[PDB]
């Protein structure tokens, strides 16, 4: 089955664009990445950086995750991110999202060997 590392890439990485280019970005990406297959996922964040730069966060500032776990890491630098939030008109299977561009530090949970991101915790 898909590994947690692979799932992170699928759900969160978009190295192909520098930023969201239109209001439809979230709608398009949430669908293409299979995030809306079973239900509309309510919130999601895409990171517009190289995968290596995001993997490197696992060796950056150790911080407690929102749930209290201690395997979270905060990036030293801000990153280009897109926030996707379900709109009032969203109705499965026609999931609808608002796209918001931001530049923020990211917080991820890391696991394994190699030690890589497996969960997106927050943007600060």
Curated annotation (Swiss-Prot):
Disulfide bonds join 26-84, 40-95, 58-110, 65-72. Pancreas. It comes from the Eukaryota. GO terms for cellular component: extracellular region. Its main location: secreted. Glycans are attached at residues 1, 7, 34, 37, 41. Substrate binds at residues 7, 10, 41-45, 66, 85. It is found in: Secreted. The keyword RNA-binding does not apply. It is an enzyme of class 4 (lyase). Keywords: Disulfide bond, Endonuclease, Glycation, Glycoprotein, Hydrolase, Lyase, Nuclease, Secreted, Signal. One of its GO terms (molecular function) is ribonuclease A activity. It catalyses: an [RNA] containing cytidine + H2O = an [RNA]-3'-cytidine-3'-phosphate + a 5'-hydroxy-ribonucleotide-3'-[RNA]; an [RNA] containing uridine + H2O = an [RNA]-3'-uridine-3'-phosphate + a 5'-hydroxy-ribonucleotide-3'-[RNA]. One of its GO terms (biological process) is defense response to Gram-positive bacterium. The active site is at 12 (proton acceptor), 119 (proton donor). Its EC number is 4.6.1.18. Interacts with and forms tight 1:1 complexes with RNH1. Dimerization of two such complexes may occur. Interaction with RNH1 inhibits this protein. Monomer. Belongs to the pancreatic ribonuclease family. Endonuclease that catalyzes the cleavage of RNA on the 3' side of pyrimidine nucleotides. Acts on single-stranded and double-stranded RNA. This is Ribonuclease pancreatic. It comes from Bos taurus.
